[PDB]
Amino acid sequence: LQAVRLYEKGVILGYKRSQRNQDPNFTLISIKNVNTKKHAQFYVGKRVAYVYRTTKHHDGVKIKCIWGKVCRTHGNSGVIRAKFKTHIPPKAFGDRVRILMYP
């Protein structure tokens, strides 16, 4: 009905890390219907929006979004690395992210 989507679903996994060592500059993100590196490469220029809600208003609104974009694929199972303006807080691991259709 209302509230058109025009974006693809993603889930924020942890950071770009090794065993017992993290690099919070890049965050791993899994996209809804991608399971191969070749298909994950289809989303590179696309912007990524992490839209979360706060307990109180900040600009008359209770919703804050932080922006990033997918830089490359991670692994060969359709997982991408995304770089955001500010580092994703680890409390957001497992949360929903929007892979937008633009550019």
Partner 1 sequence: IDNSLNTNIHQYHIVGRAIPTAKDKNPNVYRMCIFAKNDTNAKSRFWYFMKKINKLKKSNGELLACEQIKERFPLRVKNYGVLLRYDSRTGTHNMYKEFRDTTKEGAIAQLYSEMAGRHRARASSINIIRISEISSSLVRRPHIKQLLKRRLRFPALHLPTLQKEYRKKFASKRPSTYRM
Partner 2 sequence: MYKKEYVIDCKGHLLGRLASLIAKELLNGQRIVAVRCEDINISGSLYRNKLKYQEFLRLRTNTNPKKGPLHLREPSKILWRCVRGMLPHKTYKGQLALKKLKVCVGMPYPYDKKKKYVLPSALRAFRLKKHRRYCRLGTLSSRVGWNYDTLVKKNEVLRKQVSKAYYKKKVNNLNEKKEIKTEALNLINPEQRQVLENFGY
Partner RNA sequence: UUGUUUUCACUUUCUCCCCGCACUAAUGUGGGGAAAACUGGCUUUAUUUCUUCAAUUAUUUUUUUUGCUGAGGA
Partner RNA sequence: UUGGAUAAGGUGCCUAAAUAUUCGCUCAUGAGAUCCCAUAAAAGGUGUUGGUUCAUAUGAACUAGCCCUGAAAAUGGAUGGCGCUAAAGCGGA
3-state secondary structure of 2: coil
Site for partner 2 contains 7 (CB under 8 A)? no
Site for partner 1 contains 9 (CB under 8 A)? no
Site for partner 2 contains 92 (CB under 8 A)? no
Close Cβ partners of 15 (under 8 Å, ≥ 6 residues apart): 22, 23, 24, 26, 27, 28, 88, 90
Site for RNA contains 76 (CB under 7 A)? yes
Instruction: Report the partner that residue 93 touches, choosing among partner 1, partner 2, RNA, none (CB closer than 5 to 8 A by kind).
Output: partner 2
Residues that bind partner 2 (CB under 8 A): 9, 11, 13, 30, 32, 93-95
